Ligand binder design. Structure first.
Ligand SMILES: CCCCCCCC/C=C\CCCCCCCC(=O)O[C@H](COC(=O)CCCCCCCCCCCCCCC)COP(=O)([O-])OCC[N+](C)(C)C
Ligand SMILES: CCCCCCCC/C=C\CCCCCCCC(=O)O[C@H](COC(=O)CCCCCCCCCCCCCCC)COP(=O)([O-])OCC[N+](C)(C)C
Ligand SMILES: CCCCCCCC/C=C\CCCCCCCC(=O)O[C@H](COC(=O)CCCCCCCCCCCCCCC)COP(=O)([O-])OCC[N+](C)(C)C
Ligand SMILES: CCCCCCCC/C=C\CCCCCCCC(=O)O[C@H](COC(=O)CCCCCCCCCCCCCCC)COP(=O)([O-])OCC[N+](C)(C)C
Ligand SMILES: CCCCCCCC/C=C\CCCCCCCC(=O)O[C@H](COC(=O)CCCCCCCCCCCCCCC)COP(=O)([O-])OCC[N+](C)(C)C
Ligand SMILES: CCCCCCCC/C=C\CCCCCCCC(=O)O[C@H](COC(=O)CCCCCCCCCCCCCCC)COP(=O)([O-])OCC[N+](C)(C)C
Ligand SMILES: CCCCCCCC/C=C\CCCCCCCC(=O)O[C@H](COC(=O)CCCCCCCCCCCCCCC)COP(=O)([O-])OCC[N+](C)(C)C
Ligand SMILES: NC(=O)c1ncn([C@@H]2O[C@H](CO)[C@@H](O)[C@H]2O)n1
Ligand SMILES: NC(=O)c1ncn([C@@H]2O[C@H](CO)[C@@H](O)[C@H]2O)n1
Ligand SMILES: NC(=O)c1ncn([C@@H]2O[C@H](CO)[C@@H](O)[C@H]2O)n1
Ligand code: NA
Ligand code: NA
Ligand code: NA
Ligand code: NA
Ligand code: NA
Ligand code: NA
Lengths: 533, 533, 533
């Protein structure tokens, strides 16, 4: 096999040029398809052209930043020095302008919108004040992250809610997800037959969770998920001044669950501080995963609001975490170590899909069993309370009634009107004691009732509430924060960092409370920008 | 935060009084609700008053025993010394009176009831004699536990079967369980839709198992389960004279499965003797769990008889275990170590519920798969036997026919009449080779046939049997003793005590046989007290 | 208990004779039943007589070989020496006769059958040549296994396809399996109700997998599976000259999956060579398991062809493995060590059934989830391609179209006609990127369409293809070779042999390719013997 040896030697000699040429040919073929499509018809091929353009722009941008990082940093340095020199007096001017802007916005927009929006702003202040009073180290508070996190939420809300471009963008983004979740019906129909709709939740909704988990694993293998995570984490790190580890985890928890987001930084967990560990747990409790997003949309919950809430939950989580548990130690991990995220042990795309599918088995099983147990307990509790309430000739006592009268102040501070605050309080109670699947199920019921158009009151009982209240409830309920999740979060994090078991347990409860506050903070910002129809 | 530090110092200074006062206020509030309910109406609030009274009585009782244990023991000592002094002659009088009482009961009650009850008593003697002949150490038999265990069963049967108070109490207790298992329909309806009744067993019965497992975990967290276990174990220990470890496990196996009852004593397993290890396995094989109780009731099996059999199975298990495998060593574990039972790692009630729910996944999955395999094998075996039986012009040969002609003597000794003994033998065969889900399914069929009222014989084949025979079959089938369970029992116990693998394997088969004998012993006692309608 | 001690002493003294006599009595009873059945009627009892006769023959044969092995080997030795002496010249005569026979068969049978059969023979040559060119060590090729493996396939095909006895035998064997898979309906009906047919695949097909897995475990406990494996492995070892380890694994992969066949040789995995490890993986990828056989038959795929393909896949796997990755080291494991296969830790038959049932849980769960994900991805890909294809006014672009135009040459070489080659290529694509459940589902659709008798072309689109093409597709698709299975195969084999992780990864890709080639080789042989109707 002398010829074979010569071929092997030739391949070894010019390995780099051979593969580079092959990739170049593939790129040229793709560009040829794009240009030909535009030539035949442009209006029909516009989205393909747009996707190609943005991809080219980002690839060129990333290459330039990597290659010319030193030159750009040196070029920026003189301006930074000048700003540092004049900052001692310029800080008052900047702060005064920002305060004036906030005042003007309240006077000319919030007051015009109505009283409820002002109450939302007041609740935002009150929640922040309460977090300060009950802080771990009230004296040792670094206020830069708190203000920046709130400001970033306010800017995101303005761009996505009060501007036609952002409103259109997220409405389009939500509609694509709604289209994407319909593909799972093909697999559900075969496995469970054409009668799979006889059992809606089990045979139609859970397959959506399976399909999304598969896609998320495929994206992780390709590396797009990390690409977005790094881009977002840099913004939060630069503006807020947080540690790289917590910034990366917060950015990654937008798309990933509480139990799989810390895996983005596994080696460095033993060396993190208590504050960073608290922030990690807080971020997990203040967000949802991309696998369960489709199920909530299938119920009837707005896709745009869910996406907006998930994005806004990261800066709030870090801001509340820093205020609730500030940093009193020296961080050890650096930016390069945090940003590098180890992809899984998948040789090819299809193997990644199988791994994602297999992981979804325990996910759906636990979801189904937990729902069965919780609803069974709820029915038992309601029957028992009715039995106890009949002694005083009040047989209507129920878990809902107690929660409505208990969690009412929390909803009123978020800007919900007096009548609907009692209805939102029930959803808050469902989320706090059970999981958020129950709360969104009840919320979907109310949304459907309103869309039907039936009477708003029957026998003196309110049947549905306003559209604005539904939006606020959507933001407040977007989280994995429940008393039950405390144990599994602790167990998983100890399994990843056995040496830090003592520290993990200490901050878990504070993190669980911080996550709920962060969700409420997002709801307050949504409430003060939405209008009363 | 000087004020915060002062508040923290104040809380630390009087931590004990602060929490005690809070608990006192809660207790006062509960009492205020109870008294107010009684004032408004007494007949309507009676059960709440009763529950409060018994709870107060037990709390006071437990506190007094804990505080005044030494004084009470010293007060009792003189009487014990006097009894010991006169016991050498007083033992004959007591034994003679007990023998005379047994004779009188047989003559004036059993003979009046009929021949079958006398046969039940004879079978009770015969089973005990057979256990003695095939004992491990026939010479080294301690007869106190054997007689006390049988006597306790006889007293329990008299109080629960032949007295209006006990009969009413357990009928009421069974009805509450029947009400309790209906709450799972709320969760089943949502997960599996309103058509969940199209698939009865999978979508309605298994959720009952999930719900009960959840409740059992919640009770274990609160500590009620241990409270009852200690109370029962003390009675068996004091009367029978068994070791604390086996007494606790036997009392706990009334409510818990064979594989989770030994966890009540995990640390001390390596130090137990062979006899105690045999008793532990025997108790597991002679009882059922509280999670599968609802499924059996859903089939149609009597709730009262199931509860009565579960209670009566513990003294029988210990009695047969001691006789079959008596003690020839010195026990090491003491009472205080055995009674202390380590609760699970659950921070709150809701976390306990989630843990109980998660554990039920493997339970229902194994149940469903095992049933599919066993019934498929049963159909294959019956077809093969019919194929083989046709050679001799007898195509009716089947697994049922062989079992009916094989296990008939065991049922006749339990007091079943000649005609129905062949029908009970089939159920015994189903339980021995398959699990007890199959046997109870067949028993429910027969119960439904009788309740319908159709012909008792069609084409010369008996369709159903008497009510008394159904009760006896209910007692005999209440156990986890099957050839398949031998492996999983050994594996789980080795996993808990790796060093004792050699001892565990040796006694597993004897324990499996002892459990079946104990179940038969309970059935014999039930048969000799029930009447022929 | 002096009598008991005497009985124990008597049992110990003559333990061997006591159990031997008991077994003899049981054998005599069985023979009495057989003879009596024949006496009453012979034609009705014929199959029982046949089974008894063959069992007796094999038992006697095995005993004689074990006892008289040395004498037989010595008796054969002189002939072997004489053949070795004259082999230097006799080899040319034997080889020439074999070549002449092949030529005569082609001229007088293949040419008569038609052109397509000749193309199948050409494809067989071409696939072998390609494996030679891309071999790991082309110079160090041992050609004995390659020719013997192909020859054994040719002989098996002749006996099973072109002879009435073999054709009848495998048709009968397939029909028995079809009867055997109907027994699972008994368990499915109870667990999932009488409406279990509303969801065909989940509630009827998967239980078949559960039932077969249970039966396979029971057979493994009894030892029949090993008995057949040794008999087949000896034939392949003697004729082909392969190592005992790979021969045993190849014979065992006919009945067992890729992940459980290596367990037949667990201790010796660290000591195998690279070539043997490659052969093990190749055999796993070139065969299916007996648990999934029923599901494929339920779809509508021929049982006889599936059995024939599974048998023919072992010699092909070894032949291709040796050619693709020949041996350049010295094997260490011997025949006695390889043949001894350690049965599982099952005390009795029923425990084995439970263990087999439990293992099937993960099997069916992974199957269902993988199918849901793959079909969902397929729908998404097709929609995306249609969206991209509309730019060029070609909205019919799809995964099927691309695969049809890509994998066409592979199907044409196997002997499929021009029109049907494009249809077979789609099935090949489904098997390569997804699993073989999808491909067989599509194949069953085509088979049903043909059996209906509808038009073969509608709107110029072929709806179904010939019966011969369906057979060829059946042979080509019989394998577990897919890109996704690569990871799980590597993980399982590393878990069994941790030290060989580096070697396992290197040969996995070559093994995956070899398995597909082996499946194609079987299809080519089937194509050249089947006739065009
Ligand atoms: C419209 C809805 C949302 C708009 C959000 C807009 C958010 C921007 C709002 C306001 C931007 C201006 C805020 C500047 C505050 C100074 C922070 C600082 O660094 O010094 C700290 C004083 O920190 C304090 O104690 C100040 C707390 C009260 C300030 C209220 C204003 C002390 O130094 P540091 O601890 O090292 O830090
Ligand atoms: C129009 C609608 C209504 C108004 C909405 C306004 C929304 C404003 C949203 C976000 C602005 C948030 C400002 C928070 C300032 C934190 C103060 C601090 O100590 O950090 C300082 C950062 O230096 C700065 O002051 C940052 C200035 C950013 C200007 C934003 C435009 C210095 O950091 P440090 O020395 O490390 O300490
Ligand atoms: C009505 C239905 C159920 C009623 C149950 C009523 C049960 C109560 C029945 C009977 C109560 C009286 C039993 C007393 C028997 C003596 C036991 C004893 O301690 O000495 C043992 C003799 O042990 C023996 O060998 C006696 C065995 C035969 C006795 C039959 C009576 C020897 O000493 P030990 O080994 O150290 O003990
Ligand atoms: C009315 C219906 C029909 C009659 C039903 C009767 C039901 C009777 C049910 C239970 C009574 C069971 C009696 C078993 C006696 C065991 C003998 C023994 O050696 O242990 C002795 C216990 O000392 C005793 O004898 C216990 C006396 C208990 C009296 C019960 C009233 C001494 O123990 P040891 O020295 O450690 O040895
Ligand atoms: C009908 C459909 C299927 C029929 C299958 C029939 C199969 C039987 C077909 C043919 C049987 C005769 C084959 C004998 C070939 C010699 C093999 C040998 O041992 O020497 C080798 C030469 O090896 C070679 O290079 C020969 C390759 C070309 C031979 C084509 C004929 C070298 O020695 P080795 O490496 O130590 O070995
Ligand atoms: C009728 C239909 C058409 C014809 C179909 C024919 C189907 C033929 C099918 C199978 C025959 C395959 C023959 C392959 C021979 C391999 C050559 C080799 O080196 O090994 C030699 C084996 O010694 C042999 O030659 C084996 C002879 C077997 C004769 C079969 C009858 C010596 O081994 P080595 O010294 O260790 O090297
Ligand atoms: C959660 C993860 C992803 C959810 C994000 C949405 C991804 C799916 C959108 C694409 C879609 O459904 O339309 C398809 C185009 O699909 C593509 O062109 C995507 C190319 C890659 C065609 O559907 P159409 O637009 O109805 O025509
Ligand atoms: N991808 C994940 O990690 C995930 N998804 C769902 N849940 C759990 O399911 C519950 C309800 O959806 C949540 O509270 C979580 O505890 N976890
Ligand atoms: N809670 C438990 O431990 C449990 N419950 C059921 N089973 C098993 O399920 C089988 C039939 O119910 C029993 O024989 C047991 O082996 N075990
Ligand atoms: N018994 C087994 O080992 C088995 N059975 C099925 N599969 C997997 O299921 C997939 C489709 O059946 C195959 O590719 C295998 O990867 N494995
Ligand atoms: Na999240
Ligand atoms: Na949130
Ligand atoms: Na039990
Ligand atoms: Na029992
Ligand atoms: Na196989
Ligand atoms: Na194959």
């Amino acid at each position: 096999e002398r010829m074979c040896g010569r071929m092997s030697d030739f391949c070894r000699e010019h390995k780099t040029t051979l593969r580079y040429i092959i990739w170049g040919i593939l790129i040229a073929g793709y560009l040829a398809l794009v240009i030909a499509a535009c030539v035949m018809n442009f209006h029909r091929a516009l989205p393909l052209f747009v996707i190609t353009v943005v991809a080219i722009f980002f690839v060129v941008w990333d290459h330039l930043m990597a290659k010319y990082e030193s030159q750009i940093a040196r070029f920026l340095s003189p301006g930074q020095r000048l700003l540092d020199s004049h900052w001692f007096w310029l800080k008052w001017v900047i702060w005064g302008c920002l305060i004036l802007g906030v005042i003007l916005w309240l006077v000319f927009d919030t007051a015009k919108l109505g009283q409820q929006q002002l109450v939302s702003f007041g609740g935002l202040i009150i929640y922040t004040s309460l977090t300060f009073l009950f802080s771990k180290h009230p004296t040792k508070v670094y206020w830069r992250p708190v203000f920046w996190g709130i400001g970033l939420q306010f800017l995101l809300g303005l761009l996505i809610l009060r501007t036609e471009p952002g409103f259109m963008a997220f409405d389009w983004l939500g509609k694509q997800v709604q289209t994407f979740l319909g593909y799972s019906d093909a697999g559900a129909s075969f496995v469970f037959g054409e009668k799979y709709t006889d059992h809606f939740f089990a045979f139609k909704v859970l397959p959506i969770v399976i399909f999304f988990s598969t896609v998320m694993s495929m994206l992780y293998y390709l590396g797009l998920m990390q690409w977005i995570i790094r881009k977002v984490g840099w913004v939060m790190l630069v503006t807020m001044g947080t540690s790289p580890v917590e910034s990366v985890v917060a950015s990654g928890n937008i798309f990933i669950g509480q139990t799989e987001s810390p895996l983005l930084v596994r080696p460095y967990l033993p060396y993190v501080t208590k504050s960073e560990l608290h922030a990690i747990m807080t971020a997990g409790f203040s967000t949802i995963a991309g696998s369960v997003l489709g199920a909530y949309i299938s119920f009837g919950v707005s896709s745009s609001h869910l996406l907006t809430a998930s994005v806004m939950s990261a800066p709030a989580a870090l801001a509340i975490s820093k205020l609730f548990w500030p940093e009193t130690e020296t961080p050890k991990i650096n930016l390069k170590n945090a940003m590098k995220m180890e992809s899984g042990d998948s040789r090819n795309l299809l193997e990644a899909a199988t791994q994602g599918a297999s992981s979804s088995i325990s996910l759906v099983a636990n979801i189904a069993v937990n729902l069965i147990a919780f609803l069974a307990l709820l029915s038992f509790m309601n029957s028992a309370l009715s039995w106890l309430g009949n002694m005083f000739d009040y047989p209507q006592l129920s878990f809902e009634v107690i929660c409505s009268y208990v969690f009412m102040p929390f909803a009123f501070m978020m800007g919900v009107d007096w009548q609907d605050s009692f209805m939102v309080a029930k959803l808050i109670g469902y989320k706090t004691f059970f999981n958020e699947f129950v709360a969104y199920q009840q919320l979907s019921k109310l949304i459907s009732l309103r869309q039907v158009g039936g009477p708003k009151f029957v026998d003196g009982v309110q049947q549905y509430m306003s559209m604005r209240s539904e939006a606020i409830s959507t933001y407040a309920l977007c989280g994995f924060a429940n008393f039950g999740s405390l144990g599994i979060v602790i167990g998983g994090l100890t399994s990843m960092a056995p040496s830090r078991k003592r520290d993990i347990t200490a901050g878990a409860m504070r993190a669980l409370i911080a996550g709920t506050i962060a969700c409420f903070l997002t709801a307050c910002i949504a409430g003060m920008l939405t209008n009363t129809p």
